[PDB]
Amino acid sequence: MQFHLNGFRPGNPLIAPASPLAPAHTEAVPSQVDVLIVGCGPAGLTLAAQLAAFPDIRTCIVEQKEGPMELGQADGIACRTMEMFEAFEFADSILKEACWINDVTFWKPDPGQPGRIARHGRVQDTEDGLSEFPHVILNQARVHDHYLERMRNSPSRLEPHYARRVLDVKVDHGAADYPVTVTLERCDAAHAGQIETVQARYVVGCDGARSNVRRAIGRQLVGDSANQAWGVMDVLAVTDFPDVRYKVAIQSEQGNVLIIPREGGHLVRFYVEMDNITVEQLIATAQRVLHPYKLEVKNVPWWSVYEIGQRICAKYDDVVDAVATPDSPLPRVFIAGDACHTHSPKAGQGMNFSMQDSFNLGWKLAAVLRKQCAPELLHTYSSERQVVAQQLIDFDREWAKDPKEFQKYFEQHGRFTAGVGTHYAPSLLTGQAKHQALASGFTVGMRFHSAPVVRVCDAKPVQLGHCGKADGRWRLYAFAAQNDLAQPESGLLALCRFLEGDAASPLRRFTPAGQDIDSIFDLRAVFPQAYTEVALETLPALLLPPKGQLGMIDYEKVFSPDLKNAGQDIFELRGIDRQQGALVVVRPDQYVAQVLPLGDHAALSAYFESFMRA
Amino acid sequence: MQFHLNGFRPGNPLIAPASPLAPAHTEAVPSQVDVLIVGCGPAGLTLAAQLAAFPDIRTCIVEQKEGPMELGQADGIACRTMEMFEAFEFADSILKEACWINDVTFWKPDPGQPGRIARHGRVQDTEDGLSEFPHVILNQARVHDHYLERMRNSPSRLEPHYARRVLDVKVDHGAADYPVTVTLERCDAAHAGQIETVQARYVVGCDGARSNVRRAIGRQLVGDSANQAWGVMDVLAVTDFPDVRYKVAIQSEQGNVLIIPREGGHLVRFYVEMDNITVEQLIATAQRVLHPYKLEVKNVPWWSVYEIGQRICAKYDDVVDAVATPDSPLPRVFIAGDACHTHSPKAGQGMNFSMQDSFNLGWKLAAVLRKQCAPELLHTYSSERQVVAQQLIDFDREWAKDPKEFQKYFEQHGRFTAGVGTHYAPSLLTGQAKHQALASGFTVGMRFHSAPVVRVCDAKPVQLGHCGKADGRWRLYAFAAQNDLAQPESGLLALCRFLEGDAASPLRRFTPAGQDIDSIFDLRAVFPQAYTEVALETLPALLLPPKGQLGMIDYEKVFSPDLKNAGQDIFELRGIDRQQGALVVVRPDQYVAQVLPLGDHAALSAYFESFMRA
Numbered sequence A, B: 001m002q003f004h005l006n007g008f009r010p011g012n013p014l015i016a017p018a019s020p021l022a023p024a025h026t027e028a029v030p031s032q033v034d035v036l037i038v039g040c041g042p043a044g045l046t047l048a049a050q051l052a053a054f055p056d057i058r059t060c061i062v063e064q065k066e067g068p069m070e071l072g073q074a075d076g077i078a079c080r081t082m083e084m085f086e087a088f089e090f091a092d093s094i095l096k097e098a099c100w101i102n103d104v105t106f107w108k109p110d111p112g113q114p115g116r117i118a119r120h121g122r123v124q125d126t127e128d129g130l131s132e133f134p135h136v137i138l139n140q141a142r143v144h145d146h147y148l149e150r151m152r153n154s155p156s157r158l159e160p161h162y163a164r165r166v167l168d169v170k171v172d173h174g175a176a177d178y179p180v181t182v183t184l185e186r187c188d189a190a191h192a193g194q195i196e197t198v199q200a201r202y203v204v205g206c207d208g209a210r211s212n213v214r215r216a217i218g219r220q221l222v223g224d225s226a227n228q229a230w231g232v233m234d235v236l237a238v239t240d241f242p243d244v245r246y247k248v249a250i251q252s253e254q255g256n257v258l259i260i261p262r263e264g265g266h267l268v269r270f271y272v273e274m275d276n277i278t279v280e281q282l283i284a285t286a287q288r289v290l291h292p293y294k295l296e297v298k299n300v301p302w303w304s305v306y307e308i309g310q311r312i313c314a315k316y317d318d319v320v321d322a323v324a325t326p327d328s329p330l331p332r333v334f335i336a337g338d339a340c341h342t343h344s345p346k347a348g349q350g351m352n353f354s355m356q357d358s359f360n361l362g363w364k365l366a367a368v369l370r371k372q373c374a375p376e377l378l379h380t381y382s383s384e385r386q387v388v389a390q391q392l393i394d395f396d397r398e399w400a401k402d403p404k405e406f407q408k409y410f411e412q413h414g415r416f417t418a419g420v421g422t423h424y425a426p427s428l429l430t431g432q433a434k435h436q437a438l439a440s441g442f443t444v445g446m447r448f449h450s451a452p453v454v455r456v457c458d459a460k461p462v463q464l465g466h467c468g469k470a471d472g473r474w475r476l477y478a479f480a481a482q483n484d485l486a487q488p489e490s491g492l493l494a495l496c497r498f499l500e501g502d503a504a505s506p507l508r509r510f511t512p513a514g515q516d517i518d519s520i521f522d523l524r525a526v527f528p529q530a531y532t533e534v535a536l537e538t539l540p541a542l543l544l545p546p547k548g549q550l551g552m553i554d555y556e557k558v559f560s561p562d563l564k565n566a567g568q569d570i571f572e573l574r575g576i577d578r579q580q581g582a583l584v585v586v587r588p589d590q591y592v593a594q595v596l597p598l599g600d601h602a603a604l605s606a607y608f609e610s611f612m613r614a
């Protein structure tokens, strides 16, 4: 992290100075806002945390509950989700508190012994090289706590307006501004029944399975009925079952159970398959399933009956057209998370997929509100997120049931549950991949698979993808050709010359006057030479850019590979064409948009000209 | 970290429940306390943070300054210091905010060019395998902030009594209890001149170079005059000097300068050698030294003239006897940090050595106050800490000046500056090492050099030494012999049987009735077999101990080596005798006290009987 850019600032640097652009939080909900977010669940808080970074945007998030939750329903945190948490700068804390899932063990009835289970298998939960983060388990409420802290400490000093139930949402297609009218009812005793009305430019329903926003815009969850029903209980118990601290799938003649070890080393969650349910019944069933192993429950902090069918909305916004074109009406209301797609418990997605909906939408709304991107960009939210959620359902539709074909489905299921399987098809934002071989390890349309590199300014070993923070900026990862440092006339250095000095450059065309040169496009250069061979003093100013009020130099734009440790060279690991180099264009949500030749300046310009505004 | 032991507890688990044993903080300093700590510098806060973990002990820490500092004088954080920060559970946060020192570069005059410097060398700052943590740089104030937060969130809810200047300390050798009388003067305007008096059982002067506590007990810093004088300035500047983000030693005909890159990527500290100094003069000198590289200073958050000689007290307590025996008077007042030893700027110790003084004393004071250890244990504070500080001075005394002999001194200097060179000589606490070959990598008298292992309960890869938290507990790391799992009649399992069931066992003799079985002795077993081969259900209850009010099982006492990654097996890395196994006894300050045969139960008992109380 970088700080003290404009002068010494005492205290925790993660606490940003309050921006004068963001009015102080008021007891009453403001009369007009840029974005009204409905629901403080994972989807809403992810979106709020993202928008909190932009104090010039007036964001209001409402929640019917009267305050933050202390114990949540979800607890699974996927590898790709941890990568997003790193973008929000709190992955470290989650890693220290959460229960890591390293192995998953499988138990089944013992062939030579009646009414007893025995261990039948064990698998490494996350395949080697899949992600730099592990899969972990942590009370949903703690994730909310981190987002709320991020919102509070942001320049916006954003905090929720609790005890507010959104009753209706209406779009006035003839309105000049703030065309969306939201009606809310105050739920606390002190204001019970009081009605509040808010006018907004955009509204996002992150209000869950029974979303009133979805209903307001006439969308409906289409799918199959509750495929199954699960009794779920978080317990503090004593057992002699040896695998209780692992994630465990148990099949027995007494019923099926899934064990999810919880944060703290003691709490454990049991999913008991079912279909007047009491916790006593759930416990009794788990005991019968675990026999001969004993289970003595001392305390049950929470339990419930988790049952939901797989359903999905045909569209995630208020635009009727199934597939939008340049003449379709522009969207004003969006729905994210469970409000538009519910995945069966089998899917194993938990709250992970819902938060990716918000991470997709956040930067787009910010860019459009700031007049940096055409409103048409907003159509890509539904077209990207609805499609991948439906494709996921199609897969889990069949995954619901040769021996090497099963292992294949098992492996794919692992990539999907880890959240790294998302692959957007060609579109306004995603290329066709005709130059994929320039960087074969950075698949166009998929998330930027981070790899180690060494920072040239100080030899620090770092993960390249961690340059991608949740600050709304696009990233340009330029991997230099072998002779680029020695031959500035072409390749990487020529690209830099073009970006900084050519009027047609997207950097010159789209970076607002007066802002830092890397405020829209975050360019990072990676050379194949050892860090000791890259002379910073000889590089273009674009790669050692001054920024802020004092013109301080940003020394973190230049990297080399890890050449000390065998097999850790990113050019090898990510299949970079060494003789040609490659430009990997990454969106603010960390998804790869393009893999282009370093010298195709015209294509780079044309890409951004297609949706950004000068 | 483990939590929810006695029931579900919402919020950040690092915030402990307030103990009813610790009275609330009062505006006035209490009239009587167990421990009075003077000074909220690194030494005092380290000690306070340690004692804050024991709510049954009444600790009061006073400081003449009126509040916490925002910008400190020291900034170097050594590898061994990071290991202690990990023991206090905040190393993670420091790693994310601090500026890592990966390489150190050296610059000297360019042979073929007048008045100009050129790079002459580069070295990896921390040798491979030295520590699991890097050497980092971070504003002293931020370290204080972490300790203050730890103190505040501890069960004791400990916070300093600011604006108090200790004027005198007197020991009444005829007093029945609280024999030490401390006189304090309130410094704030509101109480300017008001005198407060506190009676304490023990007083620790962590009041710096001009310590009033040291003066009160007649001790004096003996040594040489200021060997040198350094102009020090923390600046936000723009330079084209290529190595500004590295730690850099610069020698030129215009003067000598040391560059220390600071947290945040922009701030930089310059030490300018000297001997009416103004910052303008310091800047002018740095510019002349850096020529032809330019240095344009935009802002100077802080600067000063750091000049101190190498001095040390002959003893760190109020006991006259040079070397205490069983008939010497018992100590009541101790001095730590700069109050008893000042190391030249060349030493490169910063605030690191001072905090180790407190980490040495903390657990000893707690054990004595709790009547768990004989008061004689307190003599070991001075005998251990004064000796290693003097030996350090002797070394830096000669280090102050064949070519392969210089590299030897350079390498040793590196181990010393990283803080891992401390090696206590045989004593009441430290053995002779006649069984050192049982575990050659765990040198008796030196800190426990952590290595990777795999936790059996959940296959989590962890650092074994991180079991050693700053909670005052002794650690017993038992490395099993090859056949121990298969032959319980001897070796590790027989040791467990002895520890839990034999009346002469130190565990049975010294663990207070009613407390958890691992409340004094934290036993961790490490087997050479893969984690998948260690059946938890077959192990003694001592290795899967129930604890707390609900009898929840602690699943973190059993480990195996990392056998997945080549060359990561701790039995190989730390030279464990595979056929014999080894018991490594580690003190609450992470220093190895003994390396004993697993079967020498008599020696284990005798060791603890020599200073613990039943």
Ligand SMILES: Cc1cc2nc3c(=O)[nH]c(=O)nc-3n(C[C@H](O)[C@H](O)[C@H](O)COP(=O)(O)OP(=O)(O)OC[C@H]3O[C@@H](n4cnc5c(N)ncnc54)[C@H](O)[C@@H]3O)c2cc1C
Pocket (backbone or CB within 6 Å): A038, A039, A040, A041, A042, A043, A044, A062, A063, A064, A065, A073, A074, A075, A076, A164, A165, A166, A167, A206, A207, A208, A209, A210, A211, A212, A213, A232, A304, A305, A306, A336, A337, A338, A339, A349, A350, A351, A354
């Ligand atoms: C009873 C129950 C048990 C569950 N158990 C599990 C489980 O065991 N494992 C698992 O993986 N997942 C479980 N889930 C699902 C998991 O909690 C969700 O998938 C996840 O929370 C979805 O995230 P989200 O952001 O889309 O919405 P949600 O988490 O559903 O949050 C929506 C939010 O919007 C608010 N809201 C709704 N309507 C309005 C309105 N009109 N006005 C204002 N605020 C409104 C809600 O109060 C809530 O805070 C469970 C869900 C429920 C309801």
Ligand SMILES: Cc1cc2nc3c(=O)[nH]c(=O)nc-3n(C[C@H](O)[C@H](O)[C@H](O)COP(=O)(O)OP(=O)(O)OC[C@H]3O[C@@H](n4cnc5c(N)ncnc54)[C@H](O)[C@@H]3O)c2cc1C
Pocket (backbone or CB within 6 Å): B038, B039, B040, B041, B042, B043, B044, B062, B063, B064, B065, B073, B074, B075, B076, B164, B165, B166, B167, B206, B207, B208, B209, B210, B211, B212, B213, B232, B304, B305, B306, B336, B337, B338, B339, B349, B350, B351, B354
């Ligand atoms: C002007 C100055 C510049 C320095 N510059 C550097 C540098 O550039 N680099 C470096 O590595 N080190 C530097 N140091 C030294 C570094 O700050 C110390 O080595 C480190 O702080 C020592 O830790 P300590 O805990 O022993 O005591 P200190 O940090 O000295 O703290 C002692 C504390 O006790 C308090 N105190 C003292 N007397 C009393 C009393 N009678 N009653 C109550 N409270 C009292 C003080 O106000 C202070 O907070 C500098 C020190 C000074 C004074």
Ligand SMILES: O=C(O)c1cccc(O)c1
Pocket (backbone or CB within 6 Å): A074, A075, A076, A077, A078, A136, A137, A247, A260, A269, A348, A350
């Ligand atoms: O994170 C998971 O793997 C998971 C899968 C199912 C339920 C659950 O709570 C967690």
Ligand SMILES: O=C(O)c1cccc(O)c1
Pocket (backbone or CB within 6 Å): B074, B075, B076, B077, B078, B136, B137, B247, B260, B269, B348, B350
């Ligand atoms: O941490 C260091 O290596 C160091 C050495 C000297 C001065 C300083 O501030 C820091």
